[PDB]
Structure 1
Amino acid sequence: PWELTILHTNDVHSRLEQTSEDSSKCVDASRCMGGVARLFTKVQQIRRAEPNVLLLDAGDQYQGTIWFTVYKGAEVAHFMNALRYDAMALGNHEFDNGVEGLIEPLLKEAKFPILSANISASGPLASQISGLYLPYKVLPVGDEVVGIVGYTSKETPFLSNPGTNLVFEDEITALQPEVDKLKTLNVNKIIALGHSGFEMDKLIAQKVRGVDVVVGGHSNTFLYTGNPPSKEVPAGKYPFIVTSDDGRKVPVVQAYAFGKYLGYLKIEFDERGNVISSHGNPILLDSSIPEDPSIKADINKWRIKLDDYSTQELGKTIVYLDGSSQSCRFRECNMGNLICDAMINNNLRHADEMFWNHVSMCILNGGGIRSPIDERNDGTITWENLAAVLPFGGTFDLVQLKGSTLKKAFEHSVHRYGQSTGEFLQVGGIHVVYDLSRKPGDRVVKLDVLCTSCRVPSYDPLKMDEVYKVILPNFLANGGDGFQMIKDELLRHDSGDQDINVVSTYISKMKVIYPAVEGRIKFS
């Protein structure tokens, strides 16, 4: 049999440095995980041992830490080139800086192919970008070849800033003719590498004839065979076996996110490229694996410009930014309003004639706001100041919630009001009135929401059966602060931009800010 070792990462999201167990800042080095210097050690060890190795990335290297804010993808090309990645699929967050922010730092500087079969360009962009990403690449591996076919979330226009000159086609529709073309070119081993999420990965494995393996991402899916090595709870076995429409067993893999794990799948192929067997497991990149000293020293050199950037003025405030618990856990606070306005600004995407913007609404746990910012330092706001407000390394995500779910979340917001608890919600595009004399669960007396399917934004009563898009912290999307109804009832969840970066970009855009408390939250 011909044996291939697939090593794979996805949704690394700017975790160039080692992290804590929860993928936020590394505080206790001896317990820290991931980062590219540790990944280099482990990939080097595996490449010593296994003859036929591919190292693949399923997208979303962009967006997540100050590394991306400052280096804008140059860090991705540089450190993925140092690791000698064999191929990468485009993720949604590779469009966060527009097509121009993908072409210049990443497509022009990567020394490996960057893939997506379901993105097409029109106009002058088509000539500008031609061949800078590819539908597939055929790579030599020992004396064999392997075809790698890329794909990217059809939803990317709602989840990033790709512009109006790219079209994201249905994945399966685009992939099939490319896979059939590779078989006519005598390429009998085919990996589908792409960035649409675990549910679409299973559909691709099921329906795209000739795909042997699916390496996916986007959904931060953790798969494992056995007792899990850390806190992540598996969504299924590694690999996840799909039975294809033509009767083949097709492994589907993913490797969580944030560079915490290295995916590792061993495939045995027969002479005709049929999979005989597949087995493996993600490897937890814990402190038992040393950081490569060379890569670490390069990371430490690149860190200097981050430390310099962290104390630069982003913009000014002329108002005290009240991020105190005594305000933000009890009533509308102007820091809360600022953060939710930045969250809605971050989620302005290209719109139909059918909506002014696809999302208008924001909730934010007040316990997630961890500092005020004083305006008496000549009004300056720095990244360092924002990192005190937002220290947890979260994201501002996009969910779809029925009105009934969101009414339950606002009841939960005040169910035990008066204890300085974190679940009290700050808001944008929502006006809420509580009556704290009512029974817990019946305290919301008015709840009005800003329309999306309207040319003039205005407020209407929340409808229990209607599904709303909402921007909220990943902490809440995952049921933090007791919001089990959000986790259990949400209809869609896509991870968004780094919390600090959302607020820093908005302050930079606005130059001078003066958020008010204006009656988004009232008590009767």
Structure 2
Amino acid sequence: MWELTILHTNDVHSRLEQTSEDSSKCVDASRCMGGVARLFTKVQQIRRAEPNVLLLDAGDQYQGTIWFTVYKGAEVAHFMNALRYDAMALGNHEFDNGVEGLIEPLLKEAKFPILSANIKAKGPLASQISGLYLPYKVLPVGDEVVGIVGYTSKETPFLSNPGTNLVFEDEITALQPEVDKLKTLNVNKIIALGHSGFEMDKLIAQKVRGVDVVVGGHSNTFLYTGNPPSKEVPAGKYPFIVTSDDGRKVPVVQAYAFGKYLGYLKIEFDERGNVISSHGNPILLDSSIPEDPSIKADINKWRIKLDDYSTQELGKTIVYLDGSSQSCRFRECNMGNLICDAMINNNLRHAFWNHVSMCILNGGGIRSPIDERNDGTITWENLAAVLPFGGTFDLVQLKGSTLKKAFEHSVHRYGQSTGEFLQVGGIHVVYDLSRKPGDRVVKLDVLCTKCRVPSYDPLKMDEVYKVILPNFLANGGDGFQMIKDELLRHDSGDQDINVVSTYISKMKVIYPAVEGRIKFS
């Protein structure tokens, strides 16, 4: 009846300090959630009360706040070491700053194993990266041993910068042999830890034989059994039980994201290394759990470098700038409208032809909301959380067919928190999700340029339009292969942050609204 307590975080996304419950900057400290210093308290309490504890991360500690912008990963390595994480699987964002941006800050500093069984190194890189990351690590858990096989999304080269010499294999194909190797080493307790999303995690559990528990992330999935503690509605019960093809019940877990919740799963194992019981729930990390003084004091030492960013206010918002994934990836969100307006305003300030009236933007690219409760105030730090990436707002030229195609893509796999869903500037779209995928756009009206008075006219499949979009999309990011393939021109614009930072500095006081640009039938 050997009991294992699995504690896990996924998609912390540079959320080192305690946050608001929407995961934005903390204002009212007493009503603030998350943090690393608050995580350390709960982890330590659990480690006291429980004999066999593992602390894991399913990737995406990289990218999100001014913490990563400045420390570029050093903060992940330093604080994950203080919290004494047992393992961490590689996420797509760990490659955002290139392989040198992963090797030097994280791989070379992390005093704990970093894992991925489907990333295959090629060329001279292989002998450089030797043992910096591993397909698995066999860990001593008291008087027993626990093997943990890692995995990273096949999609990392289309979401990040992992370079031309890392091969991203299919997870199931790359996992099953490593599991069988651990099996022939008599490792009876196998955990799959990785960054591919809940739907992938469900199949890893179903297909990869020998896996006792699947720990995941990427899809920012919140799972809960009972009455949730906050605003997150669960996708399913915690853990999610997958009846695998070999006849076992495989528990699948995820801890939402941004370090708001600490995943907690108690596992009963037999002498043979099989699951008998699998129960728990994610602990909401809040005010009712103090921040450890030593970690908090240390967090404050690292905050001196970051202080010289929030210094200047670029404007004030009288409304809540909803940049949440739960809004921006399912329907029209005021942060989308605000950004898309700033892009058009950027272009039309210095401009029938050369005039731009259209803007598209993948909702997943909107990485944080902004609270209006702090005197309306907006700083660089506030924006750096919304737009962390470092892209540009590029000018493209598209056929009515290519624009139709992208909008049909926008809602092809709708209701999955998929970031392909587009927020729009100077476009009026109407979707009918009852209809089969690819014929879900029932109306699409676009603002005209070849007109003295701009009005919305039905989109013409044979006309040519001049859209402002992020470079990520211009480059066929988010599956928009048709943009990169069928574009008739592409001129590269200005830095995403600077574009929106110019506009807020201009408007002085902003108030974007949900006015019906995107609609549903």
Distance 1:326 1:196 in 2: 19
**1:347 & 1:275 partners in 2: Cα distance?**
59
Q: CA deviation at 1:286?
A: 1.1
Instruction: Using the TM superposition, give the Cα deviation of residue 128 of structure 1 relative to its aligned residue in structure 2, in angstroms.
Output: 1.2
- Corresponding residue SS for 2:25: coil
On the 8 A contact 1:328/1:426 being kept in 2, the answer is yes
4+ runs of 1 displaced by more than 6 Å? Answer: 312-338, 341-351, 355-361, 365-382, 387-426, 428-499, 501-524
Give the conservation status (yes or no) of the 8 Å contact 1:66–1:501.
no
Deviation track 1:321-347 (CA, whole Å, cap 9, x = no partner) reads: 999999999999999999569999999
Kindly indicate whether the alpha-carbon contact (under 8 Å) linking 2:434 and 2:440 is maintained by their aligned counterparts in 1.
yes
State the 1:280 CA deviation. Answer: 0.2
For the 8 Å contact 1:411–1:440, the answer to whether it is kept is: yes
Greater mean alpha carbon deviation, residues 487-496 or residues 143-152? 487-496
State the distance in 2 between where 1:417 and 1:26 align: 32
Q: 1:513 to 1:350 in 2, by over 3 A?
A: closer
| Closer/same/farther in 2, CA of residues 3 and 378 from structure 1, 3 Å limit | closer
CA displacement, residues 166-201 of structure 1 (integer Å, 9 cap, x when unaligned): 111000000000000000001010000000000000
Partners of 1:363 and 1:153 in 2: CA distance: 25
Comparing 301-310 with 379-388, which one deviates more in the overlay? Answer: 379-388
Q: 1:232-280 CA distances to partner (integer Å, 9 max, x unpaired)? A: 0000000000001010000000000000000000001000101111000
| Maintained 8 Å contact 2:22/2:324 | no
Please state whether the residue corresponding to 1:347 is helix, strand or coil.
Answer: helix
Q: How far apart, CA to CA, are the structure 2 residues paired with 1:330 and 1:150? A: 30
Name the CA distance, whole Å, in 1 between partners of 2:426 and 2:283. 43
- Partner residue in 2 for 1:458: 455
Gap change, CA 1:421 and 1:133, over 3 Å in 2: closer
Structure 2 vs 1, CA of residues 340 and 298 (structure 1 numbering), >3 Å: closer, same or farther?
A: same
Q: CA deviation at 1:367?
A: 17
Q: 1:3 is paired with a residue of what secondary structure?
A: strand
Aligned residues of 2:23 and 2:368 also touching (Cα < 8 A):
no
Structure 2 unaligned runs (5+)? none
TM-aligned CA deviation for residue 315 of structure 1 = 18
Please give the alpha-carbon distance, in whole angstroms, between the structure 1 residues aligned to 2:271 and 2:433.
Answer: 72
Q: Quote how far apart the aligned CAs of 1:308 are.
A: 2.1
The answer to whether the aligner puts 1:277 opposite 2:277 as a matched pair is yes
Per-residue CA deviations over 1:13-59 (Å, capped at 9, x if unaligned) read 01001011111111111111000000000000000010000000000
| TM-aligned CA deviation for residue 383 of structure 1 | 2.8
Whole-Å Cα distance in 1 between the matches of residues 236 and 493 of structure 2? 24
Tell me which moved more, 433-442 or 211-220: 433-442
Secondary structure at the aligned position of 2:237 is classed as: coil
- Whether the aligned pair in 1 keeps the contact of 2:147 and 2:182 (CA below 8 Å) is yes
TM-score with structure 1 length normalisation?
0.69
Q: Deviations over 1:193-215 (max 9, x none)?
A: 00000000000000000000000
- CA distance in 1 between partners of 2:252 and 2:322 (Å): 47
> 2:402–2:486: 8 Å Cα contact kept in structure 1?
yes
Q: Which residue of structure 1 aligns with residue 379 of structure 2?
A: 382
What is the CA-CA distance between 1:494 and the residue it aligns to? 25
Instruction: Pick closer, same or farther for the CA change 1:409–1:142 going to 2, 3 Å.
Output: same
Instruction: Please identify, of 200-209 and 368-377, the stretch whose mean Cα deviation from structure 2 is larger.
Output: 368-377
CA contact (8 A) 1:138 1:147 kept: yes
Structure 1 residue 363 displacement after superposition = 3.0
Q: Do 1:224 and 1:236's aligned partners in 2 also have CA atoms closer than 8 Å?
A: yes
CA distance in 2, matches of 1:361, 1:93: 29
State whether structure 2 residue 126 is matched by structure 1 residue 126: yes
Distance of aligned partners of 1:347 and 1:30 in 2 relative to their CA distance in 1, 3 Å threshold: farther
Given the superposition, is the C-alpha separation of residues 145 and 83 from structure 1 closer, same or farther in structure 2, using an over 3 Å criterion? Answer: same
Unaligned runs of 5+ in 1: none
Which secondary structure does the structure 2 equivalent of 1:21 belong to?
Answer: coil
1:40–1:336 Cα change, 3 Å: closer
Q: SS in structure 2 opposite 1:145?
A: strand
Match of 2:417 in 1: 420
Query: Aligned pair in 2 of structure 1 residues 306, 270: CA closer, same or farther (>3 Å)?
Result: same
Structure 1 stretch displaced more, 416-425 or 284-293: 416-425
Q: Structure 1 residues 150 and 227 mapped into 2: Cα distance closer, same or farther (>3 Å)?
A: same
The 1:43–1:373 alpha-carbon spacing in structure 2 relative to 1, beyond 3 Å, is closer
CA contact (8 A) 1:24 1:393 kept: no
Distance 1:497 1:267, change over 3 A: farther
Indicate conservation of the 8 Å contact 1:315/1:512, yes or no: yes
Which range moves more in the overlay, 442-451 or 430-439? 430-439
The verdict on how the C-alpha distance between 1:301 and 1:339 changes in structure 2, with shifts beyond 3 A counting, is same
Measure the CA separation in 2 of the matches of 1:500 and 1:428.
17
Worse-matched range after superposition: 69-78 or 326-335: 326-335
Question: Is contact 1:191-1:214 (8 Å) kept?
Answer: yes
Task: Give the match for residue 165 of structure 1.
Answer: 165
- Quote how far apart the aligned CAs of 1:3 are: 0.3
Pair 1:307–1:183, CA change in 2 (3 A): same
Identity %: 99
Aligned runs of 1:358-507 on 2, under 5 Å?
363=360, 383=380, 386=383
CA contact (8 A) 2:64 2:385 kept: no
Contact 2:64–2:388 (8 Å) recurs in 1: no
Flag the 1:389–1:242 CA change in 2: closer, same or farther, 3 A: closer
Cα separation, partners in 2 of 1:156 and 1:487, compared to 1, 3 Å: closer
Q: Is the 8 A contact 2:24 2:370 kept in 1?
A: no
Deviations 1:281-329 (A, max 9, x none): 0000011000101111111111110012445999999999999999999
**CA displacement at 1:138 relative to structure 2:** 0.1
CA contact (8 A) 1:25 1:393 kept: no
Q: Aligned-pair distance for 1:165?
A: 1.1
CA contact (8 A) 1:334 1:517 kept: yes
**Cα shift at 1:457:** 24
TM-aligned CA deviation for residue 471 of structure 1: 11
Match in the other structure for 2:519 = 522
TM-score (norm 2): 0.69
Instruction: Give the structure 1 partner of residue 67 of structure 2.
Output: 67
Aligned-pair Cα RMSD in Å: 11.0
**Residue equivalent to 1:350:** 350
1:397-429 deviation digits (Å, cap 9, x = unpaired): 999999999879999999999999999998589
Cα contact 1:356–1:455 (8 A) shared by 2: no
The count of residues paired between Structure 1 and Structure 2 equals 520
Q: Is the CA contact 1:39–1:262 (under 8 Å) kept in the aligned structure 2?
A: yes
Kindly indicate whether the alpha-carbon contact (under 8 Å) linking 1:23 and 1:393 is maintained by their aligned counterparts in 2.
no
**Alignment partners' CA distance in 2, 1:348 and 1:178:** 56
- Cα distance, 1:106–1:244 mapped onto 2, change above 3 Å: same
